[PDB]
Design goal:
Largest sheet of chain A: 2 strands, parallel
Oligomer: part of a larger assembly
Shape of chain A: globular
Distance between the termini of chain A: 48 Å
Bound molecules: (2~{S})-2,3-bis(oxidanyl)propane-1-sulfonic acid
Number of strands of chain A: 2
Number of helices of chain A: 9
């Protein structure tokens, strides 16, 4: 029932029926900053990294949108958080496009930057590697099937190595009522 | 450490993480120094077998008995007490670079029960005790504080070191703590002049 909805349907028609792409820019510019700020307060490193992303990443207006802003290329896309689970990239990226559940495609140039520049930085540094490393022997059995912790046991499953955090709702109202100049002045 | 570990509640949400890894570390560090000492006992036997001089051979053999007992088990006499001390201070250097090189504590106090007993029972003389302490000094004199960072080098130039040995002072009950060993340390410093050990005396109003 498309009467009066020419704009949204034109946007949605172009992307429905398409395989999502892996966009690497957030992860690239995040990593580029973080590797220079090691040892500083983590949220300070993180803010500097987000500023690096804000300055260097491609900015976008989706064709025909009234809203400005994406965090990755046109089409359906996802982005990367190697701080969580970068130790999986070597095992998973090759199989992403043929994944029975939720396939993704990755462009060859993007994959080259991902595996040659991004993933090597995060070796020995990911949250997943650290958790797997230190988990008490009495707990491993119900947690991971394998010594690298790449396979869950699906008995007592940890869920912190595939996401940064629980769900969250920020205070949007505060942002629109005050603006970030006033928040910064605070 | 093992007993503390058995007393944790390893069914609760926290002990397995907050406390057990520390007690595991303590169990391991106790093995470390004991393993190290045991390898010395065997080195002494092998050295004894390769040594023709009968006297030094017996010396090396008594050394092996000593290193088999201490620091794993309580010292039984002055010679075991000193070699225990020696293992702890040398393994402390392996542990870390404590400023000034690790200090030696109130040697005249904690060695005195061993020294008095062996003296009385005729297993030890004061000349032999003094020789053993002086053996400590000449091997301490071969461990040189190595500062790489120029700041450390210029704040401790000339291999500056202060491996303090404390004699005299007061007991934990606040009476004078002078004993025969206190005097022995001062005699040895006069008789055997040398830049080791850093002999430090506690003074009080009495
Ligand atoms: O509460 S969370 O475990 O972060 C996510 C759940 O709300 C939706 O998947």
């Amino acid at each position: 029932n498309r009467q009066g909805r020419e704009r949204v349907y034109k946007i949605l028609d172009r992307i429905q029926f398409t395989v999502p792409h892996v966009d690497i820019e957030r992860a690239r510019y995040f990593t580029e900053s973080m590797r220079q700020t090691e040892g500083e307060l983590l949220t300070l490193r993180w803010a500097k990294a987000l500023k690096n992303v804000a300055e260097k990443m491609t900015v976008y207006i989706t064709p025909d949108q009234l809203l400005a802003g994406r965090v990755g290329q046109l089409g359906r896309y996802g982005i990367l958080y190697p701080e969580i689970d970068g130790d999986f990239y070597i095992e998973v990226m090759k199989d992403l496009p043929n994944r029975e559940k939720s396939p993704f495609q990755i462009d060859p140039a993007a994959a080259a930057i991902l595996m040659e520049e991004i993933a090597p930085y995060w070796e020995g540094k990911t949250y997943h590697e650290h958790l797997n490393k230190v988990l008490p022997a009495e707990i491993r059995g119900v947690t991971y099937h394998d010594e690298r912790g790449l396979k869950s046991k699906f008995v007592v499953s940890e869920t912190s190595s595939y996401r940064s955090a629980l769900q969250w709702v920020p205070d949007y109202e505060k942002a629109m009522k005050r603006g970030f100049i006033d928040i910064q002045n605070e | 450490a093992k007993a503390k570990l058995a007393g944790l509640d390893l069914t609760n949400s926290v002990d397995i993480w907050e406390k057990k890894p520390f007690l595991e570390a303590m169990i391991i560090v106790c093995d470390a120094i004991m393993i190290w000492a045991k390898r010395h006992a065997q080195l002494a036997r092998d050295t004894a077998a390769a040594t023709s001089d009968p006297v030094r051979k017996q010396e090396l053999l008594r050394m092996a008995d000593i290193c088999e007992h201490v620091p794993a088990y309580p010292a039984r006499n002055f010679r075991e007490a000193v070699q225990c001390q020696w293992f702890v201070q040398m393994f402390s250097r392996i542990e870390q670079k404590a400023s000034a090189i690790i200090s030696n504590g109130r040697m005249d106090q904690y060695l005195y029960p061993y020294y008095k007993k062996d003296i009385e029972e005729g297993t030890l003389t004061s000349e032999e005790a003094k020789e053993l302490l002086e053996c400590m000094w000449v091997d301490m004199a071969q461990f040189i504080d190595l500062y790489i960072n120029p700041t450390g080098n210029e704040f401790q130039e000339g291999y500056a070191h202060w491996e303090a040995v404390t004699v005299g002072g007061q007991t934990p009950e606040g009476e004078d703590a002078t004993n025969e060993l206190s005097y022995l340390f001062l005699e040895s410093k006069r008789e055997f002049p040398m830049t080791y050990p850093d002999l430090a005396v506690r003074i009080h109003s009495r």
